[PDB]
Amino acid sequence: EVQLVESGGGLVQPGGSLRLSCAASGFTFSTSWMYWLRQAPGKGLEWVSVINTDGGTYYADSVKGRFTISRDNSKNTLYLQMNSLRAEDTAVYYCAKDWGGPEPTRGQGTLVTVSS
Amino acid sequence: EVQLVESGGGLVQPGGSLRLSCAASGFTFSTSWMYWLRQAPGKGLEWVSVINTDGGTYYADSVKGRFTISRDNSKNTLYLQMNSLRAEDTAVYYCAKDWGGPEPTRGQGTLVTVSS
Amino acid sequence: EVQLVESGGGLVQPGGSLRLSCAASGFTFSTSWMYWLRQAPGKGLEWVSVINTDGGTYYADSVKGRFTISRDNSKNTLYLQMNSLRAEDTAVYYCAKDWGGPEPTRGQGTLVTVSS
Amino acid sequence: RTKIRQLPNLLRGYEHIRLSTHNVINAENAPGGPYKIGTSGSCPNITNGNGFFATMAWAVPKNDKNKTATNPLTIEVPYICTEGEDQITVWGFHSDNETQMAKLYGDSKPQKFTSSANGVTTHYVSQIGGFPNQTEDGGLPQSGRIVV
Amino acid sequence: QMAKLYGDSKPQKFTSSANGVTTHYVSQIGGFPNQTEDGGLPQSGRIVV
Amino acid sequence: QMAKLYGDSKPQKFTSSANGVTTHYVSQIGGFPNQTEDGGLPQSGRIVV
Amino acid sequence: SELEVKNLQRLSGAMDELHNEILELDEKVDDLRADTISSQIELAVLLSNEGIINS
Ligand SMILES: *[C@@H]1O[C@H](CO)[C@@H](O[C@@H]2O[C@H](CO)[C@@H](O)[C@H](O)[C@H]2NC(C)=O)[C@H](O)[C@H]1NC(C)=O
Ligand SMILES: *[C@@H]1O[C@H](CO)[C@@H](O[C@@H]2O[C@H](CO)[C@@H](O)[C@H](O)[C@H]2NC(C)=O)[C@H](O)[C@H]1NC(C)=O
Ligand SMILES: *[C@@H]1O[C@H](CO)[C@@H](O[C@@H]2O[C@H](CO)[C@@H](O)[C@H](O)[C@H]2NC(C)=O)[C@H](O)[C@H]1NC(C)=O
Ligand SMILES: *[C@@H]1O[C@H](CO)[C@@H](O[C@@H]2O[C@H](CO)[C@@H](O)[C@H](O)[C@H]2NC(C)=O)[C@H](O)[C@H]1NC(C)=O
């Protein structure tokens, strides 16, 4: 089976920073597209950042210049560096593999709450 | 060349029984569809029964419950068991290989005459 | 590179004869279509004779019965035998390989001038 | 790349229009399978789970043993509407880059497709990689594309 | 039957072209629909015309 | 000539597609009809347009 | 005021891009029809005016 185990979330003040990590197993990491998703309470899922197999990256507009996605293939890890956090960033964040067809999978999530 | 040699026909009373056999050679029997045909005098050829390569069988309506086709692949033989014969069954009966395209072939026939 | 070097031209009287030759190199001669072209002064190029890879030949109408094309594959040579020459045959003559697409090539030419 | 855009305009030309409640064929057990049924994060359904177009089933080889190139296979698509009605059948094909193709389908060469109904035939050859930018879609990045 | 008849059992492809009108077909191997409108004799094969 | 020019002498296949209109062609190897309506120079090959 | 004349709509089956040649002919049928009906209606008015003036 595929396993995706996120951690690194926490409660932090606005303007602060966090680093999320995602431990992957049970599939061929280096040939997968990798995603960060988030779910703000009251809302559905939205994509935040993705990285393809050559290290090229894409971001949602609202996180540009704030969040950075990266991958460490040798250690089967996905990272999300989150700088200059906003209250509106409060959400559960999920790592994901191959979220577009056929067999998308999501991890268990790590909560990030930004509050003064 | 292909050879098909039928025998077992005869003169028999109505309500009686016959068993036709067909000795085949010169081709790959177990991959052929096999047929019995008959020609009543004054008429053209009509099909009576056929057997495919997995032993599944088909019959003309008028012989259902009366005639049974079977094959013995190991001995290159086709059989037609003819029970409860009728006067209207009087005809020359022919064994045939692959009667539908491309190279259909017919045997020499064996006469069955049913009369009181 | 391909090289085509023609010779055998000259100044000759009408009714006379010449033999052109074409030395080929740098390609696979025996799989090429081979051509003779000519350019009369004041005009553009026109084809005179061609030979395919099985030795079949084609000629422009005006040279029929007068000019003969031949090939010697073993010696990478194309010939044009020119009998019963006419003043109107005055031109520079060119040997050519694969004149129709993709990589047509022409030799350097040899001048034939027919005059009384 | 197809006539697909005109579909809703064709439909509106009819007085009565409905989507069948039955599946015209069984995807899982279709020829060249068995197949698992692909779903996507681009198409969130009502409870936000990964879904796909109701008109189609994304057929992905279930078993590695049968995960290989195939010669063209033919299925009949039956008429399941009620007498008098026209049936409009929607179908298509997914494609991707060379490496994703190998991983998904066990083959990274171009694939070929034909349809035929009432004497009308159409032919398509797929494209491997080098796709145009995403447009008119769920706004989520994908390496692959579908043709419908 | 394909192997025996033609020496090949993969699907076969066909095209026609006349006056700018082109058509394309790919054949089917086995699994044919029931016989209809025909000579009433069983066959393993089918034609397309 | 095919082998020499393109490195392949089997028939080649082509498709076009624009505004929902699709066309399909399969090429022919050798055995071509006589030249017509052309530059009047012998060629072993032919084009389709 | 009570003349009944049928109206003109699109073909239901003819699609843009696919059937442009048919759509051109459709437009042509409409154009000629409008002209014919206009002439037909014009004569009706001219005939009405004739009858009114004669009365
Ligand atoms: C939306 O997608 C989700 C996830 O694919 C569906 O939830 C699954 O529904 C199937 C029934 O088809 C169950 O077998 C699974 O156990 C469900 N899994 C989860 C995680 O919920 C959901 O039914 C879909 N909804 C619609 C309307 O299509
Ligand atoms: C598809 O989108 C990409 C970006 O998402 C476009 O690539 C950019 O094009 C602009 C020109 O307007 C350049 O200034 C950027 O440097 C390009 N970025 C990259 C990463 O290539 C691309 O042009 C779009 N496709 C088309 C056909 O316009
Ligand atoms: C094609 O014909 C066969 C029989 O010749 C049909 O198969 C039978 O279908 C009936 C249902 O009406 C069953 O009761 C029988 O048990 C079936 N027999 C066999 C041997 O399968 C078949 O349904 C026909 N095809 C179609 C599409 O109706
Ligand atoms: C194509 O042209 C060739 C000659 O250039 C034709 O072949 C000749 O046909 C005539 C019949 O009118 C014969 O008398 C000649 O012997 C043929 N010559 C050769 C070399 O074959 C050929 O018939 C033309 N093609 C067609 C379809 O007419």
CA end-to-end distance (rounded Å), chain B: 40
Identify the H or E element spanning A61. Answer: none
Residue type, A73: N
Q: Do D71 and E10 touch (CB under 8 A)?
A: yes
Q: Do A101 and D140 touch (CB under 8 A)?
A: no
Question: What CATH number does the domain located at D1-148 have?
Answer: 3.90.209.20
Q: Which two structure tokens, joined as six digits, stand for C49?
A: 């004779």
Q: Which of A13, A1, A3 is nearest to A82 (CA)?
A: A13
Number of neighbouring beta carbons within 10 Å of residue D98: 11
Phi, psi of B54 (to 5 degrees): -105, 10
Give the ligand with the smallest distance to the CA of D134. 2
| C-alpha distances in Å from residue C23, one per residue of C58, C75, C103 | 20, 8, 18
Q: Which two structure tokens, joined as six digits, stand for F36?
A: 């017509």
**Ligand 1 atom with minimal separation from the D46 CA:** 27
Q: Which two structure tokens, joined as six digits, stand for G2?
A: 């009570």
Q: How far is the CA of D133 from the centre of ligand 2 (A)?
A: 9
Residue type, C92: V
Shortest alpha-carbon distance between residue F4 and chain G (Å): 41
Q: Indicate the DSSP class of residue G36.
A: H
Distance CA E31, CA E42 (A): 14
Q: Indicate the DSSP class of residue E7.
A: S
Give the ligand with the smallest distance to the CA of E34. 3
- Tell the residue number behind the tokens 């060469």, with chain if given: D109
How do beta strands C11-12 and C110-114 pair?
Answer: parallel
**D44 touches ligand 1 (CB under 6 Å):** no
Distance CA E12, CA E32 (A): 15
Phi, psi of G34 (to 5 degrees): -55, -45
The interface residues of chain C toward chain F in range 16-55, judged by CB-CB distance below 8 A, are 28, 31, 33, 47, 50, 52
| D71, D74, D123: residue with CB nearest E24 | D123
The length of chain B in residues reads: 116
Q: Which two structure tokens, joined as six digits, stand for D141?
A: 């990045």
- The helix/strand count (H/E) of chain E reads as 1, 2
- Tell the residue number behind the tokens 């030759």, with chain if given: C21
Mutate to test the interface with D, among E9, E26, E27 (most CBs of D within 10 A): E26
Q: Helix (H, G, I), strand (E, B), or coil: what is residue G31?
A: helix
Contact (Cβ atoms closer than 8 angstroms) between residue B15 and residue B84: yes
Q: Do E43 and B100 touch (CB under 8 A)?
A: yes
Give the ligand with the smallest distance to the CA of A102. 1
Give exposure, B80-103, as e/b (b: 16+ Cβ within 10 Å). bebeebeeebbbbbbbbbbbbeee
Distance CA A22, CA A3 (A): 10
Shortest alpha-carbon distance between residue B116 and chain E (Å): 32
Q: Indicate the DSSP class of residue E46.
A: -
